[PDB]
Design a protein around this ligand. Structure first.
Ligand SMILES: [Cu+2]
Length: 128
């Protein structure tokens, strides 16, 4: 169907949704992230990061360590299926990935890796 979704992260430390469905029809899928709240990236930055459920903890933990200059993400992290930039108020970023990379598993988690964020900024992404 539509092979894109528009996601927002804000000042409430929440994305607007906790569930994304990707139409199995799609060869590619695009996630357009924007920040409709008011703070900078160095403080209340969000990114969108996609992994298997099992990999999320490692991604979030290795992320924190990497620091704000690496967008709180380990560079070249092979667990990460798709990722955007870290963004603050009124910035945006997009990421496109192959639907084939979701063939093998069931429940994936999307999440923000800014330290602490993933307490609320965790959702499920599935292939339907
Ligand atoms: Cu965040």
């Amino acid at each position: 169907a539509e092979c894109s979704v528009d996601i927002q992260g804000n000042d409430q430390m929440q994305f607007n949704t906790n569930a994304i469905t990707v139409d199995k029809s799609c060869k590619q899928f695009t996630v357009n992230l924007s920040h409709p709240g008011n703070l900078p990236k160095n403080v209340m930055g969000h990114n969108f990061v996609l992994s298997t459920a099992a990999d999320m903890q490692g991604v979030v933990t290795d992320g924190m360590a990497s620091g704000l200059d690496k967008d709180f993400l380990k560079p070249d992290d092979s667990r990460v299926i798709a990722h955007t930039k870290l963004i603050g108020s009124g910035e945006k970023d997009s990421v496109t990935f192959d639907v084939s990379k979701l063939k093998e598993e069931e429940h994936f988690y999307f999440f923000c890796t800014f330290p602490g964020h993933s307490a609320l900024m965790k959702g499920t992404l599935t292939l339907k």
